[PDB]
């Protein structure tokens, strides 16, 4: 099977440097062109750059022109963005693609990763819970997080019907919040144990919360 | 080369066709392709050369046009086809993608569960006060959410998050979030959510009084 798989994102402060690889399987890359495609937050897909490897022939978004470079190393089968003098303006996910010709379209993508161009320091969330009180509700209130992502399951994932996790969203304070909650029975809220499974991999935090009535 | 993307936005209900615009300001002959993107995770090619459907791709998707003109056509629109669709334009570097266009499925309306949540205990030791409302399972998406604190309407003090459309039922979830220092919270005793939707026949409020009253 055909497959791009992407490494190499994060957190980097304003002014730094990046490196972001996309390792090619089942084609080699010199038989088409590679392309970086970004989308920022709450923002359209934006074309960077592309490279055809067999002739190292390039071009760049006129925005990103001189500060990024496009390589490849047709050795390894993989493709590279250099990244540098990194600006908010760059945090984005970040796709690596192959253009398929016959006339064509991007037909192989990456998974994408996350860059965030920040000063901020990385911070792991508090976890308060949202206490309930037939259906009731509760959940688990994530909150003073950075960067992104966080992940949130419940009873470790043995509940998943009816759990709804809410984006994040940035607070003023330059720090991420979301909530998670679950419906359940009612009767069951003061036999039935609920506890939030929270995640920050970027700070190394690994929260587990129980959420009772109050 | 500018591709623009019309209309912006949509609804449409399951089964009806839905036809998508995509203009360029030169003649791309037929250089143009139709992505899905799904929220959070990487675009999927549906339509390359403006017409070729791509191997896999469900046979209600379909594409025409060349040299200025071309749409994107989905014949019998289902609960999972929400997504943001993009054209692309690639007969001269620098390629070029459109804004995109939000395709929504309609149903039937569907009025929100409201439940409330107070801080709790850790949360105010750490000096802050988190209330939280909840809106589970609704259509439209449009809803009006206000807090009110001792009867007085709330300002510039809270901020909402929605999920991304339910793929089976077609449905949203709503979160708003009231931020207050402890000091502030605790000079209040009661503490509401009132929620205005098409689905409600008059405006629902859920509230607590602080201090288990």
């Known amino acids: 099977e055909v497959q791009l798989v992407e490494s190499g994102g994060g957190l980097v402060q304003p002014g730094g440097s990046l490196r972001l690889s996309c390792a090619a399987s089942?084609?080699?890359?010199?038989?088409?062109?590679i392309h970086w495609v970004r989308q920022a937050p709450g923002k359209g897909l934006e074309w960077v750059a592309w490279?055809?490897?067999?002739?190292?022939?390039?071009d760049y978004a006129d925005s990103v022109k001189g500060r990024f470079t496009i390589s490849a190393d047709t050795s390894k089968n993989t493709a590279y963005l250099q990244m540098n003098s990194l600006r908010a303006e760059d945090t984005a996910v970040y796709y690596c693609?192959?253009?398929?010709?016959?006339?064509?379209?991007?037909?192989?993508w990456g998974q994408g990763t996350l860059v965030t161009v920040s000063s901020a320091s990385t911070k792991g969330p508090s976890v308060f819970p949202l206490a309930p009180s037939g259906t009731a509700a509760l959940g688990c209130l994530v909150k003073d997080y950075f960067p992104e992502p966080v992940t949130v399951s419940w009873n470790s994932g043995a509940l998943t019907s009816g759990v709804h996790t809410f984006p994040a969203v940035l607070q003023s304070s330059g720090l991420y919040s979301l909530s998670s909650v679950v419906t359940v029975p009612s009767s069951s809220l003061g036999t039935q144990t609920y506890i939030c499974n929270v995640n920050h991999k970027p700070s190394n935090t690994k929260v587990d919360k129980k959420v009772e009535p109050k | 080369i500018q591709m623009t993307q019309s209309p912006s936005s949509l609804s449409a209900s399951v089964g009806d066709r839905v036809t998508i615009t995509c203009r360029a300001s030169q003649d791309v002959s037929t250089a143009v392709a139709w992505y899905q993107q799904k929220p959070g995770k990487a675009p999927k090619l549906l339509i390359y050369?403006?017409?070729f459907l791509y191997s896999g791709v469900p046979s209600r998707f379909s594409g025409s046009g060349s040299g200025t003109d071309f749409t994107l056509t989905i014949s019998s629109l289902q609960p999972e086809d929400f997504a943001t669709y993009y054209c692309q334009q690639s007969r001269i570097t620098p390629p070029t993608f459109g804004q995109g266009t939000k395709v929504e499925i309609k149903r039937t309306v569907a009025a929100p569960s409201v439940f409330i949540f107070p801080p709790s205990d850790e949360q105010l030791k750490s000096g802050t006060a988190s209330v939280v409302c909840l809106l589970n399972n609704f259509y439209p998406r449009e809803a009006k959410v206000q807090w009110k604190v001792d009867n007085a309407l709330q300002s510039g003090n809270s901020q909402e998050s929605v999920t991304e459309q339910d793929s089976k039922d077609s449905t949203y979830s709503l979160s708003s979030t009231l931020t207050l220092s402890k000091a502030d919270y605790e000079k209040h005793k009661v503490y509401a959510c009132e929620v205005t939707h098409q689905g409600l026949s008059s405006p629902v409020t859920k509230s607590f009084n602080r201090g288990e009253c």
């Open positions: 050369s403006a017409s």
């Open positions: 089942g084609f080699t890359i010199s038989s088409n062109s």
């Open positions: 490279i055809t490897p067999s002739d190292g022939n390039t």
């Open positions: 693609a192959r253009r398929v010709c016959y006339a064509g379209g991007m037909d192989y």
